[PDB]
From a paper:
The ferrous iron and 2-oxoglutarate (2OG)-dependent HIF prolyl hydroxylases (PHDs/EGLNs) catalyse trans-4-prolyl hydroxylations on HIFα subunits, thus promoting their binding to the von Hippel–Lindau protein (VHL), a targeting component of a ubiquitin E3 ligase, and signalling for HIFα degradation under normoxic conditions.
Indeed, we found that FG2216 (IOX3)35, used in clinical trials for treatment of anaemia, preferentially displaces NODD over CODD from PHD2.
Numbering used by the authors: 188 to 243, 246 to 404, 409 to 413
The structure:
């Protein structure tokens, strides 16, 4: 599907209505599997961190999600860069229709690997203090994921709503949601290796004034 039809007929109305939007089969099996291959290659060659220290004898320490930051131009990351370009194309075609936000900037990609040792990620808000991030975009890479046996569901707790939104981390699934306090969320314990790629998109105004908050030119 062209970035434009998805954006205009699904992503814009869904984000303005629900603030949580899922696109399945975003890039297709061939491209999705190549991205999976690149991510697994990064993992197998030690490009990830050792993992979030979950509990602290140091040999018995439990570590959780591993991460690596990817620009998309690195050797062996070109298909990740293609994913990032595709995300950018969608956001570009949503211009002026997501909230009243103006998006002209993003982060690098954060590739995350939950190692499958029963660790997850605690309930949190991505941007609770106004750092400029307005949309969280996550792409999942896990073929034939069965949450009934592997866990790893993303559970979102939409504000003002007495309800859960449970999202399985399915292969070739793209997810968008508002990054601020509207969408507290958690990753339930994962019992199999679980990969995802996240990009955050900035609202230009919030980012500009965030620079005032968290602050140079020489004076002679
Ligand atoms: O992977 C998922 O479905 C959802 N993950 C997250 O919400 C998530 N959020 C943050 Cl802020 C971090 C932050 C650092 C490392 C991993 C994260 C993560 O997986
Ligand atoms: Mn998060």
């Amino acid at each position: 599907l062209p970035a434009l039809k998805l954006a205009l007929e699904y992503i814009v109305p869904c984000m303005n209505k629900h603030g949580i939007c899922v696109v399945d089969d975003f890039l297709g099996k061939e491209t999705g599997q190549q991205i999976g291959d690149e991510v697994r290659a990064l993992h197998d060659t030690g490009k990830f961190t050792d993992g979030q220290l979950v509990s602290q004898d140091s040999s018995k320490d439990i570590r959780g999600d591993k991460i690596t930051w990817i620009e998309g131009k690195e050797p062996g990351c070109e298909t990740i860069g293609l994913l990032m370009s595709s995300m950018d194309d969608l956001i570009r075609h949503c211009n002026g229709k997501l909230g009243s936000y103006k998006i002209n900037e993003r982060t690098k990609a954060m590739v995350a690997c939950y190692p499958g040792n029963g660790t997850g990620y605690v309930r949190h808000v991505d941007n609770p203090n106004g750092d400029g991030r307005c949309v969280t975009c996550i792409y999942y890479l896990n073929k034939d994921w069965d949450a009934k046996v592997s866990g790893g569901i993303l559970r979102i707790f939409p504000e003002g709503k007495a309800q859960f939104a449970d999202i399985e981390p399915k292969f070739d699934r793209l997810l968008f949601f508002w990054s601020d306090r509207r969408n507290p969320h958690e990753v339930q314990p994962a019992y199999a290796t679980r990969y995802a790629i996240t990009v955050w998109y900035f609202d230009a105004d919030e980012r500009a004034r965030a620079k005032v908050k968290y602050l140079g030119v020489r004076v002679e």
